[PDB]
């Protein structure tokens, strides 16, 4: 029987709100903004509610307090200090466990890849059913980045960020490519070099930090929204779409089972496979340091 | 020959933002998005750029504090006391008709007829390139509270705000239709009464501070982004679009040469036509009364 | 619990094909398209199918010839004398009940009223699940047509059609507004006479001719898919949509239990309600007229 | 100032029907439907006319015989026996440099690349604003059979077809990449074979007849038509996306100034740009024989 597709966005934020207006402006689902903070989520909703006529979405948006309104949910994103994050999730794992233990749960805390292990832990949620964002922002930022040297579009540049974050965020120079042209076929073309490739790789790492730079009172938020949103539209339309997030790794990149950033297939059983890039040696090394730092971290919680 | 569609946005706050986000999103146009304060539109632009790929949009998004960044600007949307304001619009006025004077100008600035009429008279462009958004907004939001009543898809309903801003707002109630059923045929037929038209009426004008009451330290801004894109896609898309918004007004509502809510037709060449509703005698005094406060506070210049 | 949202063409046709299309490239769900014919389903969904990938669209679009791929079909979209249309539905509702009876059935069959009927009648599926295309194609002409005479958005004018086909059509002028301005405020207002809203009112009766008597060896079909499509997107998106289509009238219009072209709200339980338009009494005797040959035609059946 | 954009489709058959269609369903642009058929481009037309509304766009659709109404188009495309083929293409190059000689064209006229260099020669337009769809078809169905064979969305899988047609037709395997991961690296972890690799190339090749055997009446024109809109989308919103289309090719793959199927970048001047493809001997060969084919057929007419 038909129901409306309904997603809940944990924090009413300034990611969350940006969520609920896309996800409704698009008509992908009906939006639940959950946040504690009085007034803030109801708000927002109310302003996303009288735009839906504006761009003929039908989509309902409301701003709620109560765990009973994400009864449910089909997609569960969760948005709202280490042991502070935890605290969070804990609350929200109980909330999905009583009202909605079908959903498919995105999460977006640092550290992702430790906070997302916690999240599946303490909800006890099927491990496929939940995953981080990250890969995805950065992926874009990658694929952007190498798009602008180029000057084509970026949604015909293929290029992959997989690991952790920070210096455990591993670019996959090897992943790269343009129209179906390799990086290592324009070395040899002349039409880019190994130090502009370095370059890429660095400013993908660094990008988060010039966009807060600029904002100078708070972080990237556009982004990190659309980001969220394109995972769950994967999901909840069972695209079978390849998208790089914190997700449970087992026999991929040596790995026997846990929660790192990888190249995913998603669809409607959330994470349904992983693809294995080809990797140079120094990234071996990097992704396998960020590999025993969340393994190591998570033996701290 | 073809040029990428280019649209100004004049102010990085929150309204501004969404909208170099949405029409981004939409691919409806590369975006320069203005502002004075040192990084703020450099950073919503560098973030929102990220997100083009996702969208699967080539629309290209730049932060500058520069107006000759704004030049061959196809539309210019102007998001940033009394003469506050309008020194604001002066600076804004210079950059437009020096970089780009065929733009279609399109001000979200308080008191918005007062201001639209300021912009036109310091900036000299034509009076149809020139207006304000209000009644797409207060339109919005007067066709989601009768769509909330009868249940129905709000995109169905038919229902304009014209007049100004606040009190001076008018829902024209004679303006309402539900699928081609008027307002008082729903009263006739015992689906609602007129108490309850009072109340979305009342709701339609007090609305914004439900929404900032809540939001606590800022006011409403998703909406009034969309209503600002819907009104620049009209222009760029030569839709004939029904636009209620500030424009000015020469032989329609009584009035002989002044910008007031209406609703207007846009396509390419600005506002094009007006559209005259039947008003109730109630209704005529509303907007007799905010017609005659913008003499008012306009004729306030020293 | 998420499946891909399902459809079910019945009928390989020109309308068919595209209905097919345009589903796969909005990605609104996943299509099945069914013909007796051998190879016609299978090489348009082929087709098609290519095309997906162009839209950047993930929906599966399969051709058969098997009424079992139909199954947990959430919308049945039935395009294949008198007898002989009835045995083709007969066939069709044998297919809806036995694999996919929860489905929401829209019916492209001439003539419609009663092929609506009949299918609910030989299928048994629920009143409000059973319904049929003309409404929507019929007021988007008409819809057009007056959009035409002002020079305006379509989309911004409110025009229903109801009554039943052809010349028991009948266009609504009472539901007649543009941007809230009603009909009669127009004449008044020197824009538009009663020889032109008549001119009008006829074209929109004979519309169909006019695009047959061009294409030559065939009638209208990217239209009519388009709005199939748009049926299908109220129910499947629960929109509370206002669609004029052949729908179960039970008490309203002064009938009792019978299909009829009506301005329905379609969401997700179907035919949620029915609206009521004002009409003189020249659309009554029209309507009735409209009604009367529904009871006769239907009676026929030996 | 603002003008709407204007789209020309010669031949108001089944490609040019629907490529109007969706035209003005996306408002891409405004539409002239251009037939010396009496009727036919007049009926689908005002067909497509009374759809718009339902679609919510404001594109304007018009049928006609008199090349006049293409005056000022953006884009001309061409739908519309060698010799009569070039007899049509005489005839529109006549109208396209009377009325609209800043129209980007692309040809859907066989044998194509043959086709698009007479064009080019008799309209005598900048030889960046001549082209003809071929690539994006042939690759579109690339893409999709390695997508099936996979079980991933089709749209993450980036594979390019070159050269011209039938056997002329050259399938990139080195250009295939699937979420980054290229088609070498399948085959060394086992989800792919050589012989399953051959096949789709050689179901590539092919796939015309297996619609048009089943269509009994006709060939392909649903995505012949999607195609032909993505080439025009790609010129109107300056996308800078690659396009694999019949292009004037000049010092890539060996070529020195000849129409053929490359990777293109297209943009708001047309084909700007041409990507180098890494070929296997084999395709290299297949390439060098279409090639010839074209200049060799050049020399007849």
Redesign the interface.
């Known amino acids: ?4 597709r309904k997603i809940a966005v944990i924090g009413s934020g300034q990611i969350g ?2 969520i609920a ?2 996800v409704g ?1 698009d ?1 992908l689902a009906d939006v639940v903004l959950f946040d504690i903070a009085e ?2 989520p ?3 909703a ?11 979405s ?1 989509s309902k948006v409301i ?1 709620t307090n109560d765990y009973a309104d994400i009864s449910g949910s ?1 997609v569960v994103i969760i948005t709202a200090l280490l042991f502070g994050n935890a605290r969070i999730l804990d609350s929200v794992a109980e909330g999905v466990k009583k009202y909605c233990p ?1 959903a498919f749960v995105i999460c977006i805390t640092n550290p992702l890849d430790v906070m997302v292990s916690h999240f599946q832990k303490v909800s006890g949620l099927p491990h496929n059913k939940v995953c981080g964002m990250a890969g ?2 950065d992926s ?2 990658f ?2 980045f190498i ?1 602008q040297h180029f ?10 960020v997989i690991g952790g974050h920070g210096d455990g965020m591993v670019p ?1 120079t ?9 990086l290592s ?1 324009f070395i040899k ?1 002349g039409l880019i070099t190994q130090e502009q490739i370095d370059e890429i790789v660095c400013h993908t790492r660094i ?1 988060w930090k ?7 009172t708070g972080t ?4 990190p ?3 969220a949103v ?1 995972m769950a539209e994967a ?8 998208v790089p997030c914190s997700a449970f790794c087992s026999n991929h990149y040596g790995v026997k089972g846990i929660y790192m950033g990888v ?1 995913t ?1 998603i669809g ?1 059983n959330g994470v349904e ?1 992983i ?4 990797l140079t040696p120094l990234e071996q090394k990097l992704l396998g340091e960020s590999i025993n730092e969340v393994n190591t971290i998570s033996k701290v919680l």
Chains 1, 4 share one sequence.
């Not at 010039?210 to 100078?216: G, I, Q, S």
């Not at 693809?275 to 080809?278: I, N, S």
């Open positions: 029987m038909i129901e409306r709100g940006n207006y896309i402006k008509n007034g803030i109801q708000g927002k109310l302003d996303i509610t009288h735009s839906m006529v504006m761009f003929g039908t701003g089909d079908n995805v922002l874009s930022r694929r952007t798009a000057g084509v579009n970026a949604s015909d540049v293929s290029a992959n996959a090897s992943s790269v490519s343009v129209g179906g042209v390799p076929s073309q990008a010039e966009v807060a730079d600029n904002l100078k990237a938020y556009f982004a929204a659309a980001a394109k999901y909840l339309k069972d695209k079978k779409a390849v190249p297939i409607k496979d693809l294995e890039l080809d």
